Assembly symmetry: C2
C-alpha cells in the first residue's frame, strides 16, 4: 500500500507544480470524443469509407499528433499531413509502375522500390537541419510509402486507400490543432519568454545573496540550497530552451508576439546567461570551501566588492522586469554604469597599494573573487546590450 | 542547380563523419523486405488474417520500432510490445461492459471509458520517472485502448482485432531486433563508453597546450580553433551523454560489458569532467583577452605553472587510455601525485615572497590563472578516484 502512497504523492506534486498539465490531460480526451463523435453521427455527407478503418485512423492521428504546446501539435500535424500527401502520391505512382511492368515481377518491383526509398529516407534523417525541424515528417514518409506499397491491394483499391488515409490524417490533425489553440492555449513562445525572465531573476538573487554572504546546521543547509539550486538550474537547462525555441518557431502570431519574433536571439541571450552561471559557480565553489580568509582582510575591500555585486544584481533584476513587462527599459543603463564606476574605483583602490601586507595565499583567494566578479560585471554589460537589441528588433512597446 | 550541390556535399560529410549511418540505412531496408516476405510467402501456417491489414501493421511497426542503437530498438519494441498486450486486455473488457449494459447506452459507455483512461494516461506521461524510460509505452497504451474501443466492431470481431494487432506487433517487433543485434550492432553502451573516453582526451590536449600558449592571423585562428572548438564540445554535450545512458540500460550483455554495468557512474564522471570544462573555459578567456601581462612577469612562475599544467594532462591522458583499453590502471596515481607535489612547491615559491614587486593590476590576472589551475588539479584528483572506482564496479581486467 506504501507504493500507492508514493505514487499518489508524486501525482499531487506534479499537478500542483503546474495545472496546465491537468487541463491538457482533459483537452486530449475532448479531442478524442469530438473526433469519434464526428464519425458516429455523420454530419453532412456520409463518407464512403470503403475499407472500414476510417475511425481507427482518425483516432490514431489524434492520439499521436496532440502534444503539450501549440507549436508541438502544429508541427506534428503539419509534418504528418504533408508527408502523407506527398508519399501517397509517390505510392500510387509506384503501384502504377508495378502494374504496368508485368505479372510476376510486380511484387519484386514493389519491394525493390520500398527498399530504395526507405534507405534514402533513413539516411536523410541524419542531417542536422532535418533532425531538428522535420524529423517526424520523414518517419511518416517512410510509413506511408510502405503502407501503400507493401499492403496487397489492387489499383483502384490503392487510389481509394491513399485518399482515405489522407482525408483521415487531415481530419484528425485539424481537430487536434483547433482544440489545442482555442480551448486553453499553451504557447511555447511564452514558456520560453518566461523561462528567460526566470533565469535572469535567479541570477539576480544569487548576486545579492553573495554580496551579503561573502563577508559573513540547518539554516546553513537552507542557505546553501538557496545559493546552489538556482544557478545550478540555470546551468542544466540548455536543451529545454533549445526545444522551446523550435516549438516557438512553429507557432502562429498572437498577443504581443508579432509574426517575426526572434527566438534565436532568445537562445543567444540564454547562452550569455549560461556563461554568467559558469562564473557564479566558481564564486559559489569558493564560498563553500573550508579554507576561508580571516574576515577583516576581506572587509578591507568590502566596500567596492559589495557595490559591484549589488549593482550587477540590480541591473539583472531590471532586465528581468523589462522582459516580464514586455517593454523597452532604460534603467539597466544606470545600473550598469554604476558597476563600471565601481570597477574603476576598485582599480584605483588597488593602485593605492592596500593589499601589500597579507600573505600571498589569501591574495590567491581574494584576487580570485575579484577577478570572477569583474568578469561577471563585463558579462552583464554585454547581456544588457544584447537584451536591448532583442527588445528593439522584436518590436516592444516604446512607452516605457 | 547550385542548391543541388549544397545538398549532395552535405550528404558526403555526414557519410564520412560516421560510416555506420549508411549501414543502418540498409538495415532498415532489410527489415521491411524480410517482414514483407513473411507475409507474402506464408512460411508454415497460413494465418487467418480476418481483417486484411496484417501486412499493413507489420510494416508499420518496423518503420516505427527500428532506431539507430540497439537499446533504442530493444526499448521501443518492448514498450510497444507490452503496451499492446495489456491495453488489448483492457480493450476487450471495456467492450464487454458496453454490451452487457444495454443497446443505446453502448456508444455512450465506450466513449466515456476512452475519455477517462486517455485523460489519466496523458497525465502520467508528465511524471519524471515515466518520462525518461516508458514514455513511448504510454503513447501506445492510448492508441490501443482507443483502437479496440472507438472502432466500430461487434463482439466476436474484437477478440480478433485485439489478437491481430498483438500478433502483428510481436512479429514486426522481433524482426527489427534480430537485425539490429545480428547484422552490424550499434551498441549504445559502447557509443557512451567511447564518448566518455574521448572527452578525457579533449581536455588533455588543452592542458598540454596551455603551458605553451600561455607563456608565449591564420595560425592565430587555427590555434584559437584547436583551443576553443575542442573543449567546448564537452560543455555542450550534457544531453547526448544522458540520452545514451538511457538506452544503455536496455541492452543485453555483449562482450566485455557484464550484466550490471554501471551506466549511471559513466554519467557521474562525465558530470565532473564538465566542471573542468567550466574552469578551462575561464583560462581560455584570459588567453584571448587584449590586456595581457608582459611576458617576463609571467615567466617567474613558469616552473610550477608548466609542471602543474602538464602533469595534470598526463593524468587525464592515462584515464582516457585506461578506458579505451578497458583495463584497471594505476598509472594515474603517479601522474596525479606529481601534480599535488607541484602545488606545494608553488606555495613555498609564493610564500618565499617573489610576486611582491609587480603592479597589483597585473596580480589580478596572474593569481587568477594560478587559482583556476589549482582548482583543475584538485578536480582531476577527484576524477581519478572516481574512474578508479568505476573500473572496479564494472569488473575490468585486473591484468594491468
Amino acid at each position: 500500500m506504501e507504493k500507492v502512497r508514493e505514487i499518489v504523492r508524486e501525482g499531487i506534486r506534479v499537478g500542483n507544480e503546474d495545472p496546465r498539465r491537468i487541463i491538457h490531460a482533459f483537452k486530449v480526451g475532448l479531442a478524442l470524443v469530438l473526433v469519434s463523435s464526428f464519425y458516429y453521427y455523420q454530419p453532412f455527407g456520409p463518407f464512403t469509407d470503403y475499407f472500414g478503418i476510417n475511425a481507427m485512423w482518425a483516432v490514431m492521428t489524434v492520439v499521436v499528433v496532440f502534444e503539450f504546446s501549440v507549436g508541438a501539435t502544429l508541427g506534428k500535424g503539419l509534418n504528418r499531413g504533408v508527408a502523407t500527401l506527398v508519399a501517397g502520391g509517390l505510392g500510387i505512382g509506384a503501384h502504377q509502375l508495378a502494374r504496368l511492368s508485368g505479372a510476376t515481377v510486380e511484387p519484386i518491383l514493389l519491394v525493390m522500390l520500398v527498399f530504395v526509398q526507405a534507405a534514402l529516407s533513413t539516411f536523410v534523417r541524419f542531417f542536422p537541419w532535418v533532425k531538428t525541424k522535420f524529423d517526424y515528417g520523414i518517419l511518416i514518409f517512410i510509413l506511408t510509402f510502405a503502407l501503400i506499397s507493401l499492403s496487397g491491394f489492387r489499383d483502384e483499391e490503392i487510389m481509394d486507400l491513399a485518399e482515405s488515409r489522407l482525408s483521415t490524417v487531415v481530419i484528425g490533425g485539424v481537430s487536434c490543432i483547433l482544440i489545442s489553440i482555442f480551448v486553453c492555449p499553451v504557447w511555447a513562445g511564452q514558456d520560453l519568454h518566461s523561462l528567460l525572465a526566470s533565469n535572469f531573476d535567479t541570477l539576480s538573487h544569487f548576486l545579492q545573496d553573495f554580496g551579503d554572504e561573502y563577508f559573513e546546521d540547518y539554516k546553513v543547509v537552507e542557505k546553501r540550497k538557496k545559493n546552489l539550486e538556482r544557478y545550478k538550474s540555470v546551468l542544466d537547462s540548455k536543451s529545454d530552451e533549445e526545444a522551446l525555441a523550435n516549438y516557438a518557431e512553429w507557432e502562429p502570431p498572437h498577443g504581443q508576439f508579432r509574426f517575426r519574433h526572434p527566438w534565436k536571439q532568445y537562445v543567444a541571450v540564454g547562452a550569455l546567461l549560461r556563461q554568467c552561471a559558469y562564473r557564479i559557480d566558481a564564486l559559489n565553489s569558493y564560498i563553500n570551501s573550508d579554507f576561508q580568509i580571516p574576515v577583516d582582510i576581506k572587509k578591507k575591500l568590502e566596500t567596492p566588492l559589495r557595490r559591484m555585486s549589488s549593482e550587477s544584481g540590480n541591473s539583472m533584476k531590471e532586465m528581468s522586469i523589462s522582459l516580464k513587462q514586455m517593454i523597452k527599459s532604460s534603467s539597466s543603463d544606470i545600473h550598469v554604469s554604476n558597476s563600471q564606476a565601481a570597477c574603476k574605483s576598485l582599480s584605483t583602490l588597488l593602485k593605492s597599494g592596500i593589499l601589500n601586507d597579507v600573505e600571498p595565499l589569501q591574495m590567491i583567494s581574494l584576487m580570485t573573487t575579484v577577478s570572477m566578479l569583474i568578469d561577471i560585471v563585463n558579462l552583464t554589460e554585454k547581456i544588457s546590450e544584447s537584451v536591448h537589441e532583442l527588445a528593439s528588433a522584436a518590436r516592444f512597446k516604446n512607452k516605457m
